[PDB]
Short mmCIF file of C-alpha atoms in Angstrom, two decimals:
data_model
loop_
_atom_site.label_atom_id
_atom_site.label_comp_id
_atom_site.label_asym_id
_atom_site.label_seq_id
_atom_site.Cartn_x
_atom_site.Cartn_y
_atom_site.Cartn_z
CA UNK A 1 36.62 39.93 42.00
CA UNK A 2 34.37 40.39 38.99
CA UNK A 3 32.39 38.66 36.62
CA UNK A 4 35.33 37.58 33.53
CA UNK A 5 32.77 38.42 31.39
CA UNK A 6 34.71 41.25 30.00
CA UNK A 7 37.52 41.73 27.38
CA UNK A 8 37.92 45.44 27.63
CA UNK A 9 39.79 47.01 30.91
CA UNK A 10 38.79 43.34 32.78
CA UNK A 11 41.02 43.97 35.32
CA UNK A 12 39.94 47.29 36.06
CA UNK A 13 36.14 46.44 36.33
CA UNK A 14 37.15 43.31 38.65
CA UNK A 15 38.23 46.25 40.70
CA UNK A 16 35.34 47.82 41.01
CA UNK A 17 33.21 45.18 41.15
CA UNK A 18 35.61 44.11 44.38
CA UNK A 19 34.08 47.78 45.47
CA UNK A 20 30.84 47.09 45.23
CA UNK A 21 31.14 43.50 46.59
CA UNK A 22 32.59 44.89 49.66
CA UNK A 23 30.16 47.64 49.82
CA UNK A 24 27.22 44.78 50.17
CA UNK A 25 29.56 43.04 52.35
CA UNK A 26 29.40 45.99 54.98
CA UNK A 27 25.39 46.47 54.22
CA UNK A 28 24.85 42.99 55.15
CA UNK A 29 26.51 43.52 58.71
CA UNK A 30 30.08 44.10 57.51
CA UNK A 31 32.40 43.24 60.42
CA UNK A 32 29.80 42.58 63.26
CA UNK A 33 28.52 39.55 60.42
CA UNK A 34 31.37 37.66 61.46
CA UNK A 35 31.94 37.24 57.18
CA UNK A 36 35.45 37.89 55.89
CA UNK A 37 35.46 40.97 53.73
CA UNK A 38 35.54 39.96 50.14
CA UNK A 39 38.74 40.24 47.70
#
């Protein structure tokens, strides 16, 4: 997800914030944290 802080291409920077979420997600063990990935 993103922030909703945005009224220009929203969607579209949800997207990559999704990308970058999931991006932490793997730096902060990924799968071997035993966290679901985020959506």
């Amino acid at each position: 997800h993103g922030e909703g802080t945005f009224t220009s291409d929203l969607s579209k920077q949800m997207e990559e914030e999704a990308v970058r979420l999931f991006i932490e997600w793997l730096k902060n063990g990924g799968p071997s944290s035993g966290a679901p990935p985020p959506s």
